[PDB]
Amino acid sequence: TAPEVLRQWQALAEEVREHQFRYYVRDAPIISDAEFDELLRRLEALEEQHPELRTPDSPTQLVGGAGFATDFEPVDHLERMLSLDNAFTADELAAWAGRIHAEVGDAAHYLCELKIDGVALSLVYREGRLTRASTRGDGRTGEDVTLNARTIADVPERLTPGDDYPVPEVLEVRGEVFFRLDDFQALNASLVEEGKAPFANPRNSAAGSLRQKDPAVTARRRLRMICHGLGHVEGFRPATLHQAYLALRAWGLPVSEHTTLATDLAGVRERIDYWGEHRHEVDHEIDGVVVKVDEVALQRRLGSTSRAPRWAIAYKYPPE
Amino acid sequence: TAPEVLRQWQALAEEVREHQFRYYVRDAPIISDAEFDELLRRLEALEEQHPELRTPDSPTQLVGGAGFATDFEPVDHLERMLSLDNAFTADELAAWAGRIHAEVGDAAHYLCELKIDGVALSLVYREGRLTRASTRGDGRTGEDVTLNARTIADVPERLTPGDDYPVPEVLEVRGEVFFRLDDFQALNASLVEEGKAPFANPRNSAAGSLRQKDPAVTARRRLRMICHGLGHVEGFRPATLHQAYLALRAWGLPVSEHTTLATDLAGVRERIDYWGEHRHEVDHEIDGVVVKVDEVALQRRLGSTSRAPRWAIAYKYPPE
Ligand SMILES: Fc1ccc([C@H]2NCCc3[nH]cnc32)cc1
Ligand SMILES: Fc1ccc([C@H]2NCCc3[nH]cnc32)cc1
Structure with a gap:
């Protein structure tokens, strides 16, 4: 004392x-x-x-x-964590753009990133140490799976300090956990070999392997993670999303190499057409392409509705 | 790395x-x-x-x-931190009780505590270490004065573990910072002696001495603190307010000895009449008496309106 x-x-x-x-x-x-x-x-x-x-x-x-x-106790997100409206057709994405070009004029560029079909995870770092990880829940409250997330090889327990980018005081960062296809199959064989039922798809496998009362089960599985959004942050004020990724890299958080920055809609559409033809070559499941206004100030003038951001939209491929 | x-x-x-x-x-x-x-x-x-x-x-x-x-940066309270409705007359306090006895029946007892006329401070402990202290602000957001609060002798940097009461994972606790009368006067003399203007009253002195860009100024002043409410808590589910105080004591947080538990209104009124006559003997300023429904479950069935809890009320003396 x-x-x-x-x-x-x-x-x-x-x-x-x-x-x-x-x-x-x-x-x-x-x-x-x-x-x-x-x-x-x-x-x-x-x-x-x-x-x-x-x-x-x-x-x-x-x-x-x-x-x-792990007991999945309810835990609050610092910031809301909303889900993304979807666009399925060329006309809807155009409509979304029109609306977006009518409000924040021609200052908005579009970050284009691959939508991974896994489990959303929100992580909270307090002065560079990982404090909490939780699932989405209802957007405001999710479930505490902090121990399981601490076993994911991609998730540093501590952020790496560097010259260019000081470690924020609070950083709430969102990402997707998922299995590589080769590991989804290998896990399924290992489970059948123990008399356990296999998973029907990689998403269910990742969700199942994340949500383990005993986190040692999660540590035995080759779960992965890729950060793709920021929630609440302190000591960190990036002017754009694409530049925030640079800081995340620098601190050691996993980030995707298939993110491109597009000027206008026409760029957006080439990326969607491109990954429509080549997504099958990524070693993990790709749903579509998430298009976001990159400028954070424009991500405030545009806001969020009660259920979804107004400055982003997920374009979804048809499956087969 | x-x-x-x-x-x-x-x-x-x-x-x-x-x-x-x-x-x-x-x-x-x-x-x-x-x-x-x-x-x-x-x-x-x-x-x-x-x-x-x-x-x-x-x-x-x-x-x-x-x-x-200290730079007073805005910082969010975990839970709302609302301000208390006031009652100035015997009829209003009775009216408040009637309304309270009409909703949660006769199961509600009333914790009665001295209202101190100082500065509200909200402190946040994460696994028993003090992480943040902030002022009220607007109820949702206040100002970061964490360094200044770390100099207050009454504010342990770390909570004391004990058998009976395990240290919560998160504890957001509210209290009042104030000067004793003898120290308010001594500070005023020291300031005049440096060519500085004195404060007109102890509340302004405490507020002034708390809000110092340089926290060493605060550490030189004999500020005090008494906890009197809980905000957001994790790993701690007390059934009553009066029993939560016992845990706060146990962990080493300062708590008042003039809190009494009353059964019905008539008890409440004797306490108000009593301190009406004896408040002048407390060594610090007493405004009135804050009456709260002690049972936390009843503090949920009764809720809060947009601006104030429905399960508490501050009775205010007339000054002179
Ligand atoms: F009886 C034992 C033997 C080994 C340990 C080790 N297991 C705990 C943590 C740790 N880290 C590196 N080795 C250890 C504990 C008890
Ligand atoms: F040149 C010096 C001399 C003394 C210190 C000490 N001041 C820092 C913290 C602390 N704690 C106990 N003594 C010290 C630092 C530099």
């Missing part, structure tokens, strides 16, 4: 708890087994002198690999 | 930054000057090997006591 006592304990209980998590759940320690033994002794030493600090929730009382379960 | 590298740096940059803050701003280190020198060497060592990790925002680049200023 004395101030240095409490700073010491938290910092060490946090460090050992992490390591417990990486060893047991993710089967991937980042320190030796020896170093870890130093750490846990110290925290039990320190808990010896001050028995206020041994609680049922202490890393020293969650010893094997216990205390690591 | 390797995982243990980033965990190491953050944990150490966080530890030295704190210590810098306590030494320079608060003039109150909690470790020796020697220990601190060990810490800062290490972080500069570690920053030597990995020059990714020396940024303009690193404790090793904010060396004297720099980088510690």
